[PDB]
From Swiss-Prot:
Disulphide linkage map: 4-10
Membrane topology: Single-pass type I membrane protein
Subunit structure: The mature envelope protein (Env) consists of a homotrimer of non-covalently associated gp120-gp41 heterodimers. The resulting complex protrudes from the virus surface as a spike. There seems to be as few as 10 spikes on the average virion.
Name of the featured protein: Transmembrane protein gp41
Cell location: Virion membrane; Host cell membrane; Host endosome membrane
Organism: Human immunodeficiency virus type 1 group M subtype B (isolate BRVA)
Domain of life: Viruses
Role, per record: Acts as a class I viral fusion protein. Under the current model, the protein has at least 3 conformational states: pre-fusion native state, pre-hairpin intermediate state, and post-fusion hairpin state. During fusion of viral and target intracellular membranes, the coiled coil regions (heptad repeats) assume a trimer-of-hairpins structure, positioning the fusion peptide in close proximity to the C-terminal region of the ectodomain. The formation of this structure appears to drive apposition and subsequent fusion of viral and target cell membranes.
Residue window of the full protein shown: 591 to 603 of 852
Length: 13
C-alpha cells in the first residue's frame, strides 16, 4: 500500500 500498487501509476508529478 505505497505510492505504487505496479504498472498502474508509478508516476505522478
Amino acid at each position: 500500500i505505497w505510492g505504487c500498487x505496479g504498472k498502474l501509476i508509478c508516476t505522478t508529478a
